[PDB]
Amino acid sequence: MNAAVVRRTQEALGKVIRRPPLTEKLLNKPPFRYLHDIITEVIRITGFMKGLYTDAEMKSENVKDKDAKISFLQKAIDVVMMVSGEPLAAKPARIVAGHEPERTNELLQLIGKCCLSKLSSDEAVKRVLAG
């Protein structure tokens, strides 16, 4: 985790979303609810990952349990890998624990890239939810 990592996340998501703030302190140690804020803002704005989460799951106070947090992130990881065809090293359990923020930022960056390319996620969402 370093300045170029921060900057790349800012470049990738900065033109896509204008909240929550993409600052170094948050990106160095991202709280789950901050990640939830990013992911739902992406969905609201671009439709990337639309349908991946229920109405209830789109509200962060409904996703405070550890398992729920981990599952929320796993779904986003799966969809982004399936859509991009790129591997992510991010492990949800570690992220929820506050570890490997550089891997978390790589997830955020690939989300940004999919948004800027206007890549559809509908087929990916269907497969991921099928399990």
Written overview of the protein:
It is a single chain. The protein has 131 residues and is mainly α. It has a single domain, classed as Orthogonal Bundle (Actin-binding Protein, T-fimbrin, domain 1). The chain is 62% helix and 0% strand. The longest helix is centred in the middle third of the chain and has 19 residues, at 66-84. It is globular and about 40 Å long. The PDB classes it as protein transport. The entry lists the keywords protein transport, tubulin-binding domain, traf3IP1, MIP-T3. It forms a monomeric assembly. MmIFT54 CH-domain. The protein: traf3-interacting protein 1.
In short:
With about 130 residues, the protein is mainly alpha-helical. It has helices spanning about 5-15, 25-30, 30-45, 65-85, 90-95, 100-115, 120-130. Interacts with IL13RA1. Binds to microtubules, TRAF3 and DISC1. Component of the IFT complex B, at least composed of IFT20, IFT22, IFT25, IFT27, IFT46, IFT52, TRAF3IP1/IFT54, IFT57, IFT74, IFT80, IFT81, and IFT88. Interacts with IFT88. Interacts with MAP4.
Total of helices? 7
Shape label: globular
CATH fold field value: Actin-binding Protein, T-fimbrin, domain 1
CATH architecture: Orthogonal Bundle
- What is the domain total for the residues? 1
Helix fraction? 55-70%
Proportion of strand residues: under 5%
Distance between the termini: 32 Å
Rg, Cα atoms, Å: 13 Å
How does the major sheet shape up? none
Give me the secondary-structure category. Answer: mainly alpha
CATH superfamily: Microtubule-binding protein MIP-T3
Q: What's the level 1 CATH class? A: Mainly Alpha
Secondary-structure element string = HHHHHHH
Task: Please report the total strand number as a whole number.
Answer: 0
Main location: cytoplasm
Subunit structure: Interacts with IL13RA1. Binds to microtubules, TRAF3 and DISC1. Component of the IFT complex B, at least composed of IFT20, IFT22, IFT25, IFT27, IFT46, IFT52, TRAF3IP1/IFT54, IFT57, IFT74, IFT80, IFT81, and IFT88. Interacts with IFT88. Interacts with MAP4.
Organism: Mus musculus
Family: Belongs to the TRAF3IP1 family.
